[PDB]
Every structure is written in C-alpha cells, then in structure tokens.
Design a protein around this ligand. Structure first.
Ligand SMILES: [Mg+2]
Length: 261
C-alpha cells in the first residue's frame, strides 16, 4: 500500500488559471496526513522561488522536498542529496544563450540569478507567477558559479541546437517557454529514490502526481503515477491513471479512487 505521495506544484497542486490550490486538494492532503501518508513536493522550482505553497506549509502538511528536478532534496532542515552541473556544460550553456540572445537563469544552493532577462522572463515568472524579481548578473559571472540548475528560455529547436554542448545533463519542461537543466540522472525519479531511502519506504509504496513533461520519469517510476486531466497526451500515457482536471477536484478524486482517503 501507498506510504509516500509525490506532488508536482505547478498545474498539479497550484492551478495556472487561478494561481491557487483547490480547496478540495487542501482537504485531501489534510485527510492523508492524519492517516499517516508522507507528503512530498517534487518540483522543478528551486526553493528560492517556491512562493505558492503557504497554505500547505502553514498547515504543516509537507514532510520533505524534491527541488530543482531532483538536484536538491531536503527533509526539514537536512539536505539529503544535491548535485552540481559539470562546469564545462555550465559554460557552454552560458555561451550558447549569450550568442543566441536568450535569457538563462542560473541557480546555486543559496543564490539565484538571471542573465540578460527579457520581457518573457517578466511576463511569465513575475507577472504570471508572481515570482520575486531575480537579480541580474552577467553571463561571464554566472558561467563561473557552482550551478545546481540552469533554466534557459529556449525553444525545442534551440534545445536540439544546444544539446551537444550539454552532453551529460538532463533537460525537461514544466512550462513550454523554458527548460530546466540538471546534472546526469537528476530528475524527479532520483528525488523519489532519495526521499524513500531516507524514510525506509519501498518504491512499491509510492504514488506520484504530475501534469508536465518533467513529471514523466516520476510518473513511470512511482508504483502508481497519476496524470492531471489537462496534461498533454504523452504525460497521460506515462501515468497509470488519469484524474480530472486540476480545477475539477483532480487530486482529491484520485486520492479517493485509490483509497488513500
Ligand atoms: Mg507541473
């Protein structure tokens, strides 16, 4: 039976339409918590920009975090796993984005920076997602930092063009306009493995929930993968179960279906 729940944030817990968590999702997680489910976040966001979970956090419902697509995982105050991108690949992404004229975010353990931000950074991160403005730094300075995640604002065509210069990194998307890049093997699947190692939970006892391409590995990896009803077809196909759309009680309905609650 299920012991650990892994939730993506954007499009899974938090609606892109309303920018809020559905009330029935909060009630479902309350009920699961009391039954002893462990509740984990599994997000491409770095901690620095997780500004949309206060309802869950203030209710003390979250037992641990997988952030930066698995490249930075912690339980309470304790970091249980982290990684960094090979510096050659950091440099090559910075050079690519600078030449192409596209912005890129560079995330360190305790700092976050953006290089050559444009209005699409503003339109998506600040105005749509209400993320606090990220400080600007030069590509040169960013290219020398110890980087856990890079988030280039590149198309899928630009992604194919920079792929040979990030030969070992993972790349995935939770939103079409940008991608997240992390070191070899660092996907939300890695995050699940680290969290369940910490708690003595078996893979066979896990359930994941997601809406995006960066959820596919964890939808496949968990014993039961749940795709949100509005997810694209390839996300749905990676899941075991497709629930209702987020704003039609999709999380609660899935949890009830399985008898989690
Ligand atoms: Mg998502």
């Amino acid at each position: 039976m299920t012991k650990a729940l892994f939730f993506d944030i954007d499009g899974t817990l938090v609606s892109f339409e309303t920018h809020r968590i559905p009330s029935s999702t909060i009630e479902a997680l309350e009920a699961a918590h009391a039954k002893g489910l462990k509740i984990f976040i599994a997000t491409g966001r770095p901690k620095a920009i997780i500004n949309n979970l206060s309802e869950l956090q203030d209710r003390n419902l979250i037992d641990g975090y997988i952030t930066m697509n698995g490249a930075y995982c912690f339980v309470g105050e304790e970091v249980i796993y982290k990684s960094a991108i090979p510096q050659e690949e950091v440099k090559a992404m910075a050079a690519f984005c600078e030449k192409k004229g596209v912005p890129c975010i560079f995330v360190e353990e305790h700092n976050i920076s953006v290089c050559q931000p444009n209005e699409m950074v503003k339109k998506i991160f600040y105005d749509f997602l209400h993320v606090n403005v990220i400080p600007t730094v030069s590509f040169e300075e960013a290219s020398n930092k110890e980087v856990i995640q890079m988030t280039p604002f590149i198309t899928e065509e630009e992604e194919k063009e920079v792929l040979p210069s990030i030969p070992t990194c993972e790349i995935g998307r939770w939103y079409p306009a940008f991608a997240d890049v992390t070191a070899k093997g660092d996907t939300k699947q890695k995050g699940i493995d680290e969290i369940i190692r910490h708690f003595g939970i078996k893979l066979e006892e896990t359930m994941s929930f997601g809406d995006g391409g960066n959820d596919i590995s964890m939808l496949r990896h968990a014993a039961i993968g749940v795709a949100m009803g509005q997810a694209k077809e390839d996300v749905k196909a990676a899941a075991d179960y497709v629930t209702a759309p987020i704003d039609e009680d999709g999380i609660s309905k899935a949890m009830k279906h399985f008898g989690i609650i």
